[PDB]
Amino acid sequence: ADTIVAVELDTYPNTDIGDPSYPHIGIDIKSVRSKKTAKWNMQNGKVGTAHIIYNSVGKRLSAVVSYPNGDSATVSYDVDLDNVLPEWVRVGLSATTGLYKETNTILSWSFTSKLKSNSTHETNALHFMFNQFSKDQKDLILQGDATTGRDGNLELTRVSSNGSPQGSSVGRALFYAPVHIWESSAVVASFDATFTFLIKSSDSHPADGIAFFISNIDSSIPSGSTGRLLGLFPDAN
Amino acid sequence: ADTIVAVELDTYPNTDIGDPSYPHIGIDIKSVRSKKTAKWNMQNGKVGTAHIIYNSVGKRLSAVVSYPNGDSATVSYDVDLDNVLPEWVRVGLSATTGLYKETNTILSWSFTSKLKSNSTHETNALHFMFNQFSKDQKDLILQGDATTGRDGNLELTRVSSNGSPQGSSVGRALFYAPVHIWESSAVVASFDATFTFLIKSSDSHPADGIAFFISNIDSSIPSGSTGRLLGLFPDAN
Amino acid sequence: ADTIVAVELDTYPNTDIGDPSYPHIGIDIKSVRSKKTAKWNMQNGKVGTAHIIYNSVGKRLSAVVSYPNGDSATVSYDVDLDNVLPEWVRVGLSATTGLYKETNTILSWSFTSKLKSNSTHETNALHFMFNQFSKDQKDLILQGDATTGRDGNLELTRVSSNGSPQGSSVGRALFYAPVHIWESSAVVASFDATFTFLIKSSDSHPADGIAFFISNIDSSIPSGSTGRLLGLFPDAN
Amino acid sequence: ADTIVAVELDTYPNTDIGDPSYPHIGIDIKSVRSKKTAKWNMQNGKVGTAHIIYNSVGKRLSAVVSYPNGDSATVSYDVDLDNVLPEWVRVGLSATTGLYKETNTILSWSFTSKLKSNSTHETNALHFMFNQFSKDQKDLILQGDATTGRDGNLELTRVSSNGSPQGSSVGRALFYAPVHIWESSAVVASFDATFTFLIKSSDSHPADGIAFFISNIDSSIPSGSTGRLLGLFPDAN
Ligand SMILES: OC[C@H]1O[C@H](Oc2c[nH]c3ccc(Br)c(Cl)c23)[C@@H](O)[C@@H](O)[C@@H]1O
Ligand SMILES: OC[C@H]1O[C@H](Oc2c[nH]c3ccc(Br)c(Cl)c23)[C@@H](O)[C@@H](O)[C@@H]1O
Ligand SMILES: OC[C@H]1O[C@H](Oc2c[nH]c3ccc(Br)c(Cl)c23)[C@@H](O)[C@@H](O)[C@@H]1O
Ligand SMILES: OC[C@H]1O[C@H](Oc2c[nH]c3ccc(Br)c(Cl)c23)[C@@H](O)[C@@H](O)[C@@H]1O
Ligand SMILES: [Ca+2]
Ligand SMILES: [Ca+2]
Ligand SMILES: [Ca+2]
Ligand SMILES: [Ca+2]
Ligand SMILES: [Mn+2]
Ligand SMILES: [Mn+2]
Ligand SMILES: [Mn+2]
Ligand SMILES: [Mn+2]
């Protein structure tokens, strides 16, 4: 199976798999059962911003999610990703719907990774930033139901012609280049990611959420990973 | 055929194809016959640095090549790359040898491209930096004789076990992700590239040189493009 | 007198000093009489974006001004700033009103300067970005009527309590740190600046405009430089 | 008194003030008595690199110091700098000698700070990088014995004509612009700093060390702060 590290913006409480009984943000290390969560007051129809930050010195993965009205939720977890992830990875965004649904619209996404070696003034780095997505966005690998270009956005899950989100959908977008996320001889390895999103739901309950994730380079959507599994995990272990 | 825009560091004068009778730097637009050149005093065995700069507003492609002793050569050419290149490209480094030879060793390479739209505060961008190259450098596409990892460097052309450059060699390295180099609706499109290199030759005449290039995404080494064609062009038209 | 290099967004045609008979953008080298101008269709009450770009290799100063509806104006001028400016400078924004008036509201401002030496991998650089301005913005030097903090913006010229722009006003904001804009031993010196602005006028004719400028470090508003002199020049020579 | 947060590279063990009995790196919050230290094997005459990293989400200040041979030391400390520092600060480097001495030579220094607001896509940021220091480095405030320009370096403490470090010396260099290090309404505030240094000593014991520090904007060298107080603190409380 794939190796997954993710920050989840989980809009639907699945208590059977350890979700608290409210929308929440979470840090997921090789399991959909978050290692740490925080209560998140998701604002229907508003544009939110998620920031994710990590460095190999502090060994603390942190995320904050905020809206323009100033409300925010944060979660941090002590983890040495050198000991979890493979050296080379791909990075991406994933989202799902299940019985319940929501738009999983990404308006922007940026990422920076740096490896600083012990050799003086020697750094390798990658940075990308998307503030618009075209219909043919060649530097993205789209999986599942994900599409680009609708109003210049990235729609991770299926939306009808009229804008209505569909159930039982899963989609992901991965940056085309592999990323060298750590190296044994690096003195510092760090990364940051930011994305903005618009989650909207008309009926009783948004679901299921959006995640930023880091995976093995050949990661694909696991079979049956719609709904609560967020397009990331093959089961809820 | 491919579409190529390149900055050449040409170490060997091929007067039959318009080279001046001295090593030179040149700007090549869809032809190995440079649109503009400047005399370049290549320092055998020293580490040089090339900087390449362009933006769609000024429409001027510029390059400077320097050594630590302060000697430098510069060349600029007025060109609207919006009207030359396809919208999506790959970027890379290329080098060759022919009857005569040299090491074509790359010690570092960085690149930044930005597309700034008319939509306020909306930019797409890509940046990468290599100061070391590993034996398995997954975010590079190596073509021809190019290898990575020897002393942490990128060797564009063939070098023997003992360090001796070989003749009739061609190799290229392209960044793995396609790059969105221009867009009709962009207000500014800009890019910059820098690389450091060590060209060394023992005998009578180094050849043939190193180039930074931008190509169609599916660009491959043209058949028979060793020596004076720099791994870039199928002929000298 | 000060030494000034500026990009002007000139909203009011003063034909006596060489303005064309329409709003225009211009490149000003040591004189308010622009070396080059382009027609600019200023959109009353809309947020515009100006980008300014220069490098010492190409020796071409360029500016583009755009609005979200896609309309833009561009101007470029060949100039070697190494031969014009002092080595150390301050950078800033300036605006004025005269008999006629407008809001000269700055919503964001960024700047990057880099000096790349002949010594391998040695660069000096400065970058700043403002997307909000507080009432006490300590890293700005405010001159004349300029204020910060009103709706988180920078108001270069005087606006009343009720939002009405006042006539005969001049104000500037300079970044607090001096900037090393060129150096004889640098192989490349480059800078970029971007700012977003909202110019609004109720009556017959907006005036007078906004400029991005680079000056001697001790630059101050010249006496009598309201109106057509843009807070930059002591006279119209 | 000033408010100081610092990372110390402490070359001389002063056990009376809580130093361990070996050279060490330490995190100092409002006291020279480090909150956390780690053993540091200082390599006489070699160029070291210090990286310092912090963000307001994770609330963990980290530092690593390394040499090209791969040896490194790291220290991290949980601290919410929002609750320690004033909103506006200056950042700098400090060093001292006492009865014993060493060169405190800085070869490069970079710093980045970012404030990301809850308003979507609104960030304020400052970045600077020095890889060479001139005799008149106008964007630095030099205090005490600090000088710039000797071999293009920053010498924090006094060195004679012939290169010999002098005792009882203290000097600091602060970036000229104040830095907005936190803001109550910011969702993320982060900073990073890196510097390279060459500490050399001829005799029995190097002393006293180098520190990266963040202070109130009007910070000056406290009276009597040579030697073990590192130019940072007025006493050893
Ligand atoms: O989209 C929200 C959820 O819908 C499904 O689970 C259900 C939530 N409430 C229900 C009520 C009845 C039935 Br049958 C089901 Cl499967 C569910 C499943 O698709 C879940 O994976 C998912 O998280
Ligand atoms: O490496 C330098 C050059 O060597 C070859 O051309 C020759 C340069 N001097 C010669 C002398 C004899 C013969 Br045969 C040849 Cl092909 C050459 C060719 O491989 C050229 O493409 C190349 O630029
Ligand atoms: O604000 C626009 C302009 O107003 C003034 O010039 C005039 C423009 N039309 C006028 C009509 C009458 C008189 Br008196 C004057 Cl000074 C002017 C002056 O303040 C100018 O410097 C300025 O550019
Ligand atoms: O430079 C190293 C140290 O030298 C001085 O302390 C001494 C270290 N060993 C000594 C031996 C004798 C005397 Br007197 C003194 Cl003050 C010292 C003092 O200047 C200290 O602050 C300093 O850390
Ligand atoms: Ca859930
Ligand atoms: Ca040639
Ligand atoms: Ca005018
Ligand atoms: Ca000590
Ligand atoms: Mn969950
Ligand atoms: Mn040539
Ligand atoms: Mn004008
Ligand atoms: Mn100590």
Tokens 């680009």 -> residue = A148
- D59 pairs with which residues across the strands? none
How far is A72 from A42, CA to CA, in rounded Å?
A: 9
Q: What's the CA-to-centroid distance between C220 and ligand 10, angstroms?
A: 50
Which residue minimizes the CA distance to atom 16 of ligand 4?
A: D99
Q: Locate the DSSP E strands across D11-46.
A: 24-29, 36-39
Least Cα distance to B208 among B59, B9, B40 occurs for: B9
Atom number, ligand 2, closest to the C-alpha of residue B96: 1
How far is B85 from C91, CA to CA, in rounded Å?
A: 35
Q: Do D138 and C88 touch (CB under 8 A)?
A: yes
How far is C66 from B202, CA to CA, in rounded Å?
A: 55
Q: Any idea which fold C1-237 has?
A: Jelly Rolls (2.60.120)
Q: Where are the alpha helices (DSSP H) in C2-55?
A: none
The SS3 of residue C16 is helix
All residues at 6 or more sequence positions from C40 whose CB lies less than 8 Å from its CB, including other chains: C9, C10, C22, C23, C24, C25, C65, C73
Taking residue B44's Cβ as centre, other Cβ atoms within 10 Å add up to 12
Q: What's the CA-to-centroid distance between B91 and ligand 2, angstroms?
A: 28
How many Å lie between the alpha carbon of A62 and the closest alpha carbon of chain D?
Answer: 6
How far is C48 from C67, CA to CA, in rounded Å?
A: 5
Q: Do D72 and A116 touch (CB under 8 A)?
A: no
Per-residue DSSP letters for B204-225?
A: S----EEEEEEE-TT--PPTT-
Ligand closest to the CA atom of residue C227: 3
Rounding to the nearest 10 degrees, give the CA dihedral for residues D129, D134, D140, D143: 130
Taking residue B28's Cβ as centre, other Cβ atoms within 10 Å add up to 23
For residue D188, what are its two tokens?
A: 């993320």
* Phi, psi dihedral angles at C114 (to 5 degrees): -140, 140
How far is B125 from B113, CA to CA, in rounded Å?
A: 6
Q: Give C165's DSSP letter.
A: B
CB C169 within 8 A of CB C199: no
For A119, the closest of D51, D53, D68 (CB atoms) is D68
For residue C41, what are its two tokens?
A: 């269709």
Burial of B73 (0-12, 13-18, 19+ CB in 10 A): buried
Burial of D184 (0-12, 13-18, 19+ CB in 10 A): exposed
B100 touches ligand 2 (CB under 6 Å): yes
Tokens 């739209």 -> residue = B117
CB D176 within 8 A of CB D139: yes
A98 touches ligand 1 (CB under 6 Å): yes
Ligand closest to the CA atom of residue A8: 9
Q: What's the CA-to-centroid distance between B119 and ligand 10, angstroms?
A: 41
CB B217 within 8 A of CB A138: yes
Element holding D149 (H helix, E strand): strand D147-150
How many Å lie between the alpha carbon of A206 and the closest alpha carbon of chain D?
Answer: 22
3-state helix, strand and coil shares in percent for chain D, rounded to the nearest 5: 5, 45, 50
Partners of B63 on chain C (C-beta within 8 Å) are: 57
Least Cα distance to B182 among B75, B37, B34, B79 occurs for: B79
Record the resolution, in angstroms: 1.6
For residue C5, what are its two tokens?
A: 């290099």
B207 touches ligand 2 (CB under 6 Å): yes
Ligand closest to the CA atom of residue C226: 3
Q: Do B120 and C47 touch (CB under 8 A)?
A: yes
CB B10 within 8 A of CB B20: no
How far is C169 from C120, CA to CA, in rounded Å?
A: 48
How far is A37 from D207, CA to CA, in rounded Å?
A: 47
How far is B51 from B64, CA to CA, in rounded Å?
A: 5
How far is C189 from C81, CA to CA, in rounded Å?
A: 10
Is the torsion defined by CA of B36, B40, B44, B48 positive or negative? negative
Per-residue DSSP letters for B38-64?
A: EE----TTSEEEEEEEEETTTTEEEEE
For residue D23, what are its two tokens?
A: 């050279």
Distances (CA, A) of C188 to A127, A213, C92, C182: 23, 39, 22, 9
For residue A151, what are its two tokens?
A: 């109003």
Burial of D25 (0-12, 13-18, 19+ CB in 10 A): buried
CB B156 within 8 A of CB B103: no
Distances (CA, A) of C26 to A233, B10, C74: 57, 39, 9
For residue C85, what are its two tokens?
A: 């400016």
Tokens 């008036």 -> residue = C101
Q: Do A58 and D58 touch (CB under 8 A)?
A: yes
Partners of A124 on chain B (C-beta within 8 Å) are: 129-132
Which residue minimizes the CA distance to atom 16 of ligand 1?
A: A99
Q: Which amino acid is at D104?
A: N
All residues at 6 or more sequence positions from A156 whose CB lies less than 8 Å from its CB, including other chains: A93, A94, A95, A104, A105, A106, A145, A146, A171, A172, A173, A210
Q: What's the CA-to-centroid distance between A150 and ligand 5, angstroms?
A: 26
For C117, the closest of D126, D127, D132 (CB atoms) is D132
* Phi, psi dihedral angles at C105 (to 5 degrees): -95, 125
For residue A232, what are its two tokens?
A: 């990331």
**Alpha carbon A225 to chain centroid, angstroms:** 15
How far is A184 from C104, CA to CA, in rounded Å?
A: 53
* Phi, psi dihedral angles at B228 (to 5 degrees): -65, -15
Q: Give C218's DSSP letter.
A: T
Least Cα distance to B133 among B160, B157, B106, B170 occurs for: B106
Least Cα distance to D95 among D9, D216, D14 occurs for: D9
Which residue minimizes the CA distance to atom 10 of ligand 2?
A: B99
CB C110 within 8 A of CB C209: no
Distances (CA, A) of A138 to A53, B177, B179: 26, 8, 8
For D64, the closest of A67, A68, A187 (CB atoms) is A187
Least Cα distance to B108 among C120, C142, C44, A57 occurs for: C120
Q: Do D122 and C130 touch (CB under 8 A)?
A: no
A100 touches ligand 1 (CB under 6 Å): yes
All residues at 6 or more sequence positions from B175 whose CB lies less than 8 Å from its CB, including other chains: A177, B90, B91, B92, B111, B128, B139, B140, B141
Q: Do C57 and B57 touch (CB under 8 A)?
A: no
Which residue minimizes the CA distance to atom 20 of ligand 2?
A: B227
Least Cα distance to A88 among A7, A4, A183 occurs for: A183
Q: What's the CA-to-centroid distance between D21 and ligand 12, angstroms?
A: 10
Per-residue DSSP letters for chain B?
A: ---EEEEEEE-S--GGGT--SS-EEEEEESSSS-SEEEE----TTSEEEEEEEEETTTTEEEEEEE-TTS-EEEEEEE--GGGTS-SEEEEEEEEE-SSS----EEEEEEEEEEEEESSTT-EEEEEEEES---TT-TTEEEEET-EEEETTEEE-S-B-TTS-B-SS-EEEEEESS-EE---TTEEEEEEEEEEEEE----SS----EEEEEEE-TT--PPTT--GGGTTT-SS--
Q: Do C122 and D128 touch (CB under 8 A)?
A: no
How far is A131 from B116, CA to CA, in rounded Å?
A: 9
All residues at 6 or more sequence positions from D227 whose CB lies less than 8 Å from its CB, including other chains: D96, D97, D98, D99, D168, D207, D208
B13 touches ligand 2 (CB under 6 Å): no
Element holding C149 (H helix, E strand): strand C147-150
Per-residue DSSP letters for D54-115?
A: EETTTTEEEEEEE-TTS-EEEEEEE--GGGTS-SEEEEEEEEE-SSS----EEEEEEEEEEE
Q: Where are the alpha helices (DSSP H) in chain C?
A: none
CB C53 within 8 A of CB C111: no
Tokens 């430098």 -> residue = B72
Mutate to test the pocket of ligand 2, among B9, B33, B100 (most ligand atoms within 8 A of CB): B100
Distances (CA, A) of A105 to A174, B179, D119: 15, 23, 18
Ligand closest to the CA atom of residue A209: 5
Distances (CA, A) of A60 to A108, A115, D38, D58, D74: 25, 17, 19, 7, 14
Partners of A47 on chain D (C-beta within 8 Å) are: 120
Number of CB pairs < 8 Å for B and C? 84
Burial of D139 (0-12, 13-18, 19+ CB in 10 A): middle
Ligand 4 neighbours (beta carbon < 6 A): D 12, 14, 97-100, 207-208, 227-228
How many Å lie between the alpha carbon of A213 and the closest alpha carbon of chain B?
Answer: 19
- A118 pairs with which residues across the strands? none
Q: Give D159's DSSP letter.
A: B
The SS3 of residue D16 is helix
Q: What's the CA-to-centroid distance between D97 and ligand 4, angstroms?
A: 9
Least Cα distance to C49 among C191, C155, C193 occurs for: C193
Ligand closest to the CA atom of residue C40: 11
Q: Give D221's DSSP letter.
A: P
Burial string for B163-194 (b: 16+ CB within 10 Å, else e) reads: eebebebbbbbbbbbbbbbbbeebbbbbbbbb
Number of CB pairs < 8 Å for C and D? 73
CB C109 within 8 A of CB C154: yes
Partners of A81 on chain D (C-beta within 8 Å) are: none
Tokens 């020897």 -> residue = B150
- C170 pairs with which residues across the strands? C96
CA angle B49, B137, A114 (to 5 degrees): 70
How far is C105 from C47, CA to CA, in rounded Å?
A: 9
How far is C64 from C38, CA to CA, in rounded Å?
A: 10
All residues at 6 or more sequence positions from B236 whose CB lies less than 8 Å from its CB, including other chains: B16, B17, B32, B33, B228, B229
How far is B38 from B53, CA to CA, in rounded Å?
A: 16
Element holding D179 (H helix, E strand): strand D179-180
- D117 pairs with which residues across the strands? D186
Using only the alpha carbons of chain B, give its radius of gyration: 17
Q: What's the CA-to-centroid distance between D166 and ligand 4, angstroms?
A: 14
How far is C194 from C182, CA to CA, in rounded Å?
A: 20
Mutate: best of D40, D60, D61, partner A, most A CBs <10 A: D60
Tokens 């867009």 -> residue = B183
Distances (CA, A) of A68 to A47, B75, C32, D117, D186: 8, 48, 42, 9, 11
Using only the alpha carbons of chain C, give its radius of gyration: 17
For C57, the closest of B64, B185, B196 (CB atoms) is B64
Atom number, ligand 2, closest to the C-alpha of residue B168: 19
Is the torsion defined by CA of A198, A202, A205, A208 positive or negative? negative
Is the torsion defined by CA of C175, B117, C50, C84 positive or negative? positive
Distances (CA, A) of A66 to A41, A52, A157: 9, 12, 22
How far is B168 from B7, CA to CA, in rounded Å?
A: 21
Q: Give D173's DSSP letter.
A: E
How far is D69 from D41, CA to CA, in rounded Å?
A: 12
Residue C130: closest CA among chain D residues belongs to which residue? D124
Quick one: three-class SS letters along chain A? Answer: CCCEEEEEEECCCCHHHCCCCCCEEEEEECCCCCCEEEECCCCCCCEEEEEEEEECCCCEEEEEEECCCCCEEEEEEECCHHHCCCCEEEEEEEEECCCCCCCCEEEEEEEEEEEEECCCCCEEEEEEEECCCCCCCCCEEEEECCEEEECCEEECCCECCCCCECCCCEEEEEECCCEECCCCCEEEEEEEEEEEEECCCCCCCCCCEEEEEEECCCCCCCCCCCHHHCCCCCCCC
CB B142 within 8 A of CB B221: no
How far is A156 from B187, CA to CA, in rounded Å?
A: 28
Q: Do B177 and A177 touch (CB under 8 A)?
A: yes
Exp. method: X-ray
For A178, the closest of B117, B131, B176 (CB atoms) is B176
Least Cα distance to B42 among B128, B92, B100, B110 occurs for: B100
Using only the alpha carbons of chain D, give its radius of gyration: 17
Q: How many residues does chain B have?
A: 237
Partners of A63 on chain D (C-beta within 8 Å) are: 57
Burial string for A115-145 (b: 16+ CB within 10 Å, else e) reads: bbbbbbbbbbbbbbbbbbbbeebbbbbbbbb
C130 touches ligand 3 (CB under 6 Å): no
Least Cα distance to C211 among C61, C17, C5, C18 occurs for: C5
Atom number, ligand 4, closest to the C-alpha of residue D100: 1
B19 touches ligand 2 (CB under 6 Å): no
How far is D17 from D208, CA to CA, in rounded Å?
A: 13
Residue A49, CA atoms < 13 Å, CB-side half-sphere:
23
Is the torsion defined by CA of B155, B156, B158, B164 positive or negative? negative
- C193 pairs with which residues across the strands? C52, C111
Tokens 């290898």 -> residue = B147
For residue C60, what are its two tokens?
A: 């071409």
Cα of first residue to Cα of last residue in chain A, in angstroms, is 12
How far is A105 from A118, CA to CA, in rounded Å?
A: 41
The SS3 of residue C29 is strand
Partners of B36 on chain C (C-beta within 8 Å) are: none
How many Å lie between the alpha carbon of A176 and the closest alpha carbon of chain B?
Answer: 6
